[PDB]
Structures are given as structure tokens and as C-alpha cells.
Design an enzyme around this catalytic site. Structure first.
Site, short mmCIF file in Angstrom:
data_model
loop_
_atom_site.label_atom_id
_atom_site.label_comp_id
_atom_site.label_asym_id
_atom_site.label_seq_id
_atom_site.Cartn_x
_atom_site.Cartn_y
_atom_site.Cartn_z
N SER A 29 0.82 -1.14 -0.08
CA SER A 29 0.16 -0.07 0.19
C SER A 29 0.82 1.27 0.04
CB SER A 29 -0.80 0.11 1.29
OG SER A 29 -0.13 0.07 2.57
N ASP A 86 6.43 -3.44 8.38
CA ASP A 86 6.66 -3.17 7.02
C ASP A 86 8.16 -2.77 7.11
OD1 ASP A 86 4.30 -3.75 6.24
OD2 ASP A 86 3.55 -1.67 6.81
#
Ligand SMILES: Nc1ncnc2c1ncn2[C@@H]1O[C@H](COP(=O)(O)OP(=O)(O)O)[C@@H](O)[C@H]1O
Ligand SMILES: Nc1ncnc2c1ncn2[C@@H]1O[C@H](COP(=O)(O)OP(=O)(O)O)[C@@H](O)[C@H]1O
Ligand SMILES: [Zn+2]
Ligand SMILES: [Zn+2]
Lengths: 306, 309
Positions: free
Chosen positions: B9, B232
């Protein structure tokens, strides 16, 4: 901490638009918020390209999200290539609204027009954009980086000499931007036919003390994409550090440009064959490998004050 | 030059997904090709958020563009959060095809599904993803970074102790990945209740058919706040450091965790200063101080020592 709202194209591979502007600003210490106007696989310099575009409504949705969260406070806004007048008009609304909460916000605009290679799957920029740039964009822009061709369209005047360029730059100043930099021109440089000539002008407002400069860079024998975006992004950083010294700001900006391009052309020729011309895929800017040069560029050009 | 294909994303503001993974890899010297699976104004930790999503077809279009230009050569593929099984299935096809041209491609996968906040797990993704991760993703993944909750779902086993965790990690190795890192767990650390325990395991099949396995434990002092994008950031840096120390999971994890520490400390200090005194930092104030941690990400001062098990 300085926060930049950059609204430009995004490519999966390569460097153009937001891809050419984010890494430089980040390593230079800027907090960059990126709105990708489009997402393509690569730029139009390739034989193929696929991707999707964002319409003015989607741009609005994103901005609305930031607004709803009260995090729409910026110090700089940075835009470049756009081929949809509706999108461009939306950008101006956003900038105006932002300059309302922060009268100190600086808007850096690179008014791209023509058959340039970009990262928005487009082969050209519709003529119906010129009037939007001329009457809505330029008036609210603080720093603009047009090339000779763009400077002419914006002022309806043609440039045949150094003196005419300075006149066109003055016309642009009266339209709004206190800083104008003509990034490249057809003017023959006194140094030689192999040098590219760039001109700069800054109105420091109290009478208007105008600083004008000229720069000559030796041309690299190849066609690059994203160089204009990289230029505008770095000029933003360096003008921030040297707010009243366009000379130094441009010298560091152009020096970096040189280092990145030299590294880029050397690696391109090394990857292609002997006598084999580098392909656009091989000419993608060596951004990551130029980190040190972007952070602190060894000056290699001297701007002459006019 | 090592090229990474990162599919995650994108948020306009803040750091999560591709925003948390690109800058670190770039300053570390990696060529990052980013495919944004979505584009939101910010992460869901805020009270509002707007944006658009990419469907499996659009993902395919992008990959096709790279393929048509013969520039679909990668060394690493990196994926994380996904909420659409169709998209995830598309990712696996892409990875398989890439591993065909380059048998040496390494696929780093963070199988996001949920966390164990206090004691009970909570799924962020539709349950119909677990089967896809289990039978299609994990089998082609080379490095996975699940949390305790995710490790349990993938193996259908519960973890009550350090020994059970090691068994679950062995089960994951059998499923495919030679490297497994359980990034966070509910296991009480011997150092104290304020430390977060992470476990790591890397398998190496010797020439004669013997199997050497390096296992390590790491304890990190908890920071008193809820961060987003930390998983992440973790996976992105582990990719970089495992590349430099290919056979030494110990060092790779020590550098990775040390960087996490530096980034989080700088982040919580700035958050509290921006909040006001006594006032709790808001999610907007807690966004990772990525840019201001450049030096620490490039060369982290080691602050944790991994215990070899
Ligand atoms: N072939 C080249 N050799 C040297 N510099 C170049 C070359 N191409 C672009 N540049 C640099 O990039 C900037 C020009 O960007 P460019 O693509 O030409 O933008 P524009 O079209 O807006 O004038 C200048 O600062 C220039 O020095
Ligand atoms: N509050 C915290 N204190 C210390 N470290 C943290 C904290 N939150 C996250 N981390 C770090 O981030 C990584 C964990 O990411 P996290 O949010 O916990 O992911 P996951 O839930 O996928 O296990 C670990 O390396 C860990 O050290
Ligand atoms: Zn241009
Ligand atoms: Zn996670």
C-alpha cells in the site's frame, strides 16, 4: 521540519515525476507527502507502458482525507507534468486553500508543456492547458522552472537573445513568481555550442532588488527523462537553505545534476554493448547510487551574475 | 545492483506499507520498483481516511508493462498487508513466473492477518485469506516474518512456550521458507515483563543431506505507544541485512532490531514533545520519523545482542 506536498506521476520502474522528486527531498531532510497523479509501469520513453490515471475527483478525495484529519499543514507544494486541465484546476484550489492557513507556504511549479516524455502514458499536453497555467497557476506560484519553449508560451513572446530572455523573465515576475529559472534554452552560450544555457532571476522584495544569473552546463550526449522533475525538487531544497541567494542555490542544484547525469551515462554505456547506443531502459537515472552527490554536491559550475 | 519489486500500500502522508519500505531500502543501496496496491490519504489509525484500491486486474496490467519491455528481472520480491485474496493469488503467479527467469530470486513475505494485543487474536483480513497464505504463498516464500498470532494460524498450532515456538518455526520451514522470524510474541522474556521477545530460525541443508539450523532469541524493551508501519519497516530492513549477511541470521537480526530501536526512540521523543506534557501522543504525532533516522538506518549502532539457541 519542513513538509512538502508533491503531486506528480508515479512509475513502478525508473525515475520520473514523484519518483524523481521524493528520494532527493527525503535524503535532503524533507518530510515528503506524495500524491501520485497516475501509476504507470514506466515512462513513455519505452515502447510500451500500462497503468491507471487519477481524476480530479480522486485527487479531491485524498486531500479531503488530510483535511478531515487536520493534517493539511504544508510548507511547500510541488507540481510538474499534468495533461488534464481539470486536475490542474483542482491543484490551484488546493494551493490557494493551503496558502490560507500558511501564508508562508511556497509553491514550486514546473509548467510542463509540449511533446515531452512523461510518466502519465501521454504523448503530448493539450493546448487547452496554456490558459490555465497562464491565468490560474502562475499567479499563485512562487518558484517556476519553465524551459525556453514554456517561458515563451506563458508570455506570448519569443526569445532570440539573452536580453529578451531577461525581459520575458521580468514579465513572469509581474505575473506572480518571485523566482524564475529557465532550465534550458536554444541560446548559444559564449562558452561554446556544446554548453546548455540556463538563466535565473529572483525578485527579493523596500524596492525590488533583482538578482539575475546565467549558467552554462556541458551537454551530455543522450536523452534523459525525469531530469526536469529532479531539477525542480533539488532547487526547492537548496533555495530553502539559501533563501536569498539564488546564485548558490542554482550552483548546488546544477552541480548535483551533473554528478547524477555523469554517473548515469557511464553506467548506461557500460551495460550496453560496444558502439551500441544505450536504450531508454538503460538510461534511467542512477538515483540511489548518487545519494552522496545529492546530499552534498561538489560544485562544478559557477553562476555568473548579470 | 540488487533490484526489489515491492508490492504494498501507499499513503500520501505517514509511513506504512511501501512508504515504510522504500526509503530504507533506497538509502541502503537497493533499486526499488514499487507497485502501490492502494493509495490512501493516511493509515487507518486515524479517525478518517480516503483513497482508492487496485484490483488484481490492474496489478496484472502493471506487471504486463514491465514484461512487455523485458524489464521484469528482479532479485527480490517483497509483499505485506493484503486484504483481497484475488490480489494475493495474483502476486503468487507473478513470483512463480519471476523465479523461473531467476531461480535465485528471494521472496520476502510478511503474512499480515492480525495480532495478539493482550491475549485474544483479532483478524484484520477476511478469513478466506489464511488458506491462500498457507497453500500458495508460504510454499514459494524464502523469508517470512509472521508475528505469534500469524505463525499459529499458518500451522494450526498454539504457542505456549519458547520450545513450542521453535517447533512451529520448524513446521514453517517444512512448508517452504529457509528463514523464519517471529517478530513479536506474548512469551514472557527471561529479562523482564517489559521486554518484547522475537525468535529467529534459518535453515541450511548441508551437501551430505544433514540439516544445520541456526536459531536465535531477541529481547527488546517495549516503547510505551502503539506504532503503525513497524512491521513493514522490519521486513524491509531484514531483507537488506540478510542480503549482506546471507548465512548469518544473528548479525542480520541484530542490525535490523538495532535500527528499529533508534527509529522508535527518535519517534517517541518527538511525539511527546509535539503533544504537550501529560497529553498522549496522537496517531498523527506517532508517524515514524523515517527521514530523520537516515543515519541510523544506514549504519545502526548495535544495542541488542541475539542469544543463540
Ligand atoms: N543531455 C543533457 N546534458 C546535460 N544536462 C542535461 C541534459 N538533459 C537535461 N539536462 C539538465 O536537466 C535540466 C533540464 O531539464 P530538461 O529535461 O531539459 O527540462 P526542460 O525540458 O524543462 O528544459 C537542466 O538543469 C540540465 O542541465
Ligand atoms: N512498542 C514497541 N516497543 C518496542 N518495539 C516495537 C514496538 N512496537 C513495534 N516494535 C518493533 O517492531 C517490530 C514489530 O512490529 P509489530 O507492530 O509488532 O509487528 P507484528 O505485530 O507483525 O509482530 C519488532 O522488531 C519490534 O521490535
Ligand atoms: Zn520541463
Ligand atoms: Zn505484522
Amino acid at each position: 521540519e519542513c513538509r512538502v506536498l508533491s503531486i506528480q506521476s508515479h512509475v513502478v520502474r525508473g525515475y520520473v515525476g514523484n519518483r524523481a522528486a521524493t528520494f532527493p527531498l527525503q535524503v535532503l531532510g524533507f518530510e515528503v507527502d506524495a500524491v501520485n497523479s497516475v501509476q504507470f509501469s514506466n515512462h513513455t520513453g519505452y515502447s510500451h507502458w500500462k497503468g491507471q490515471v487519477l481524476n480530479s475527483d480522486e485527487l479531491q478525495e485524498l486531500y479531503d482525507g488530510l483535511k478531515l484529519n487536520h493534517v493539511n499543514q504544508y510548507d511547500y507544494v510541488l507540481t510538474g507534468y499534468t495533461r488534464d486541465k481539470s486536475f490542474l484546476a483542482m491543484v490551484v484550489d488546493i494551493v490557494q486553500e493551503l496558502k490560507q492557513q500558511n501564508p508562508r507556504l511556497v509553491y514550486v511549479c514546473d509548467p510542463v508543456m509540449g511533446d515531452q516524455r512523461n510518466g502519465e502514458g501521454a504523448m503530448y499536453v493539450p493546448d487547452d492547458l496554456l490558459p490555465v497555467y497562464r491565468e490560474k497557476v502562475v499567479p499563485v506560484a512562487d518558484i517556476i522552472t519553465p524551459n525556453q519553449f514554456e517561458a515563451e508560451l506563458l508570455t506570448g513572446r519569443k526569445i532570440h537573445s539573452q536580453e529578451e530572455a531577461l525581459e520575458v523573465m521580468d514579465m513572469l515576475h509581474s505575473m506572480g513568481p518571485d523566482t524564475v529559472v529557465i532550465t534550458s534554452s536554444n541560446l548559444l552560450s559564449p562558452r561554446g555550442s556544446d554548453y546548455l544555457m540556463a538563466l535565473g532571476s529572483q525578485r527579493t522584495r523596500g524596492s525590488v532588488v533583482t538578482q539575475r544569473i546565467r549558467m552554462e552546463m556541458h551537454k551530455v550526449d543522450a536523452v534523459f527523462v525525469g531530469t526536469g522533475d529532479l531539477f525542480a525538487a533539488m532547487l526547492l531544497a537548496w533555495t530553502h537553505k539559501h533563501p536569498n541567494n539564488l546564485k548558490v542555490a542554482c550552483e548546488k542544484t546544477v552541480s548535483a545534476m551533473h554528478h547524477v547525469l555523469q554517473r548515469t551515462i557511464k553506467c548506461a554505456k557500460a551495460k550496453s554493448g560496444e558502439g551500441v547506443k544505450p536504450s531508454p531502459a538503460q538510461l534511467e537515472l542512477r538515483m540511489v547510487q548518487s545519494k552522496k552527490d545529492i546530499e552534498s554536491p561538489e560544485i562544478v559550475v559557477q553562476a555568473t551574475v548579470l
